[PDB]
Design an enzyme around this catalytic site. Sequence first.
Site, mmCIF file in Angstrom:
data_model
loop_
_atom_site.group_PDB
_atom_site.id
_atom_site.type_symbol
_atom_site.label_atom_id
_atom_site.label_comp_id
_atom_site.label_asym_id
_atom_site.label_seq_id
_atom_site.Cartn_x
_atom_site.Cartn_y
_atom_site.Cartn_z
ATOM 1 N N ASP A 181 0.823 -1.214 0.000
ATOM 2 C CA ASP A 181 0.000 0.000 0.000
ATOM 3 C C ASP A 181 0.860 1.269 0.000
ATOM 4 O OD1 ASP A 181 -2.552 -1.273 -0.046
ATOM 5 O OD2 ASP A 181 -3.211 -0.381 1.846
ATOM 6 N N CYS A 215 -2.257 0.629 -13.537
ATOM 7 C CA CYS A 215 -2.310 0.637 -12.084
ATOM 8 C C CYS A 215 -3.457 1.567 -11.728
ATOM 9 C CB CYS A 215 -0.948 1.018 -11.515
ATOM 10 S SG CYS A 215 -0.146 2.505 -12.246
ATOM 11 N N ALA A 217 -3.276 5.287 -11.584
ATOM 12 C CA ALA A 217 -3.132 6.380 -12.563
ATOM 13 C C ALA A 217 -2.492 5.964 -13.890
ATOM 14 C CB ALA A 217 -2.308 7.527 -11.951
ATOM 15 N N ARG A 221 3.654 2.497 -10.900
ATOM 16 C CA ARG A 221 3.931 1.060 -11.088
ATOM 17 C C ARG A 221 3.951 0.673 -12.570
ATOM 18 N NH1 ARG A 221 -0.329 -0.917 -6.400
ATOM 19 N NH2 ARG A 221 0.292 0.685 -4.859
ATOM 20 N N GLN A 262 6.781 7.829 -10.445
ATOM 21 C CA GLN A 262 6.147 8.888 -9.656
ATOM 22 C C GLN A 262 6.961 9.382 -8.466
ATOM 23 O OE1 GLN A 262 2.256 6.671 -9.084
ATOM 24 N NE2 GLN A 262 1.385 8.716 -9.390
#
Length: 282
Positions: A181, A215, A217, A221, A262
């Site tokens: 998470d 994923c 957005a 990942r 990101q």
Amino acid sequence: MEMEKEFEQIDKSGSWAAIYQDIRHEASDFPSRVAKLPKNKNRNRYRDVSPFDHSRIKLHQEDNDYINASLIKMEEAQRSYILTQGPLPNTVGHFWEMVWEQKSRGVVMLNRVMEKGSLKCAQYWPQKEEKEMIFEDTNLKLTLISEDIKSYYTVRQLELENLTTQETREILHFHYTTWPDFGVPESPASFLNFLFKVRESGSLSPEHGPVVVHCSAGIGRSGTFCLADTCLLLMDKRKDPSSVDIKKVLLEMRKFRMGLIQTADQLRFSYLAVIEGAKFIM
Ligand SMILES: C[C@@H](O)CNC(=S)N[C@H]1C[C@H]2CC[C@@H]1C2
């Protein structure tokens, strides 16, 4: 510089944030006018993640051809990928329309439907054989054929039927279920094992349309997945594998979709994955 020793040099000097900010400063900026039209507001999960106009995937529909999805075309490596956001309640039919029209064999999913107590994408595939899904807006039927649950990922066989022509196709769903998470995995071993399973299936190969990868957005990942794949392929193709420059490959990919990778932790994880992956290849 080479990769593994550039890696230790950034660790010892603790400069991952500065390296990552350089990438952000140098990245391409292209228009995304179609994504920002008012009629498309409920087709975008995040207001700051949009496909560029020049590389966006167009639906074969005359009313509204928009989906939040980009074609990443890697010329030297001879690989193509479609990167997209996790489908929304009002875009699940568009998603499968794209899979059909682009002739993809595989769908790669790198998130869970719920993370951090919130919904990260719609439940867009059927969970029981006898309970198929029908998408009336795009006239498609989707059926779960089989499911193989492993410790880090699940593979599903799906049947997609175009109800207009009664044509059917087999789609493979590769679902990486254990990304944490928060943060990134401690070891890249299970991510690499997953990548190799996708490869072995034929889903990344030129006899099919581009793989669809997502994923929440479609940049974090998802960026890690295609960056690692392309870098490893270039290390196999070239006379001098130490010439492969992961920062340059990432900047090339960012010509086709904004924001890939990101965080600085995702950048470091991508280095780790390519480094370890290059030893197993031989
Ligand atoms: C010797 C170093 O500069 C290695 N250069 C690399 S890996 N270039 C890549 C960036 C995009 C355009 C060409 C390939 C894909």
